[PDB]
DNA sequence: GGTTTTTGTCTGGCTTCACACTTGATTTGCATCACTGTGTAAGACAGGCCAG
């Protein structure tokens, strides 16, 4: 799932490149 | 069902080779040479059973 969530947050975000560890936090959450 | 594992996910900044291009003198790869001895089998041949 994670690929896809990150891959969706790339226009969501619009140029950032996230941290390993919120990002994992954030794919867990949902 | 809980309790245990495998195997992924997301980045980049890292380290470690391969490739890039040239020249010409070495080094390798590979097929070939000339050549007889030896096995194999295509011949020839004397031989002995038997009939006129």
Redesign the pocket.
């Known amino acids: ?3 896809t ?3 969706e947050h ?1 226009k969501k975000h619009p140029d950032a ?2 941290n ?1 560890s919120e ?2 936090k954030k ?1 867990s959450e949902r």
Request: glycine letters at 0%.
């Open positions: 799932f994670v690929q969530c990150r891959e790339k490149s996230v390993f990002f994992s794919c």
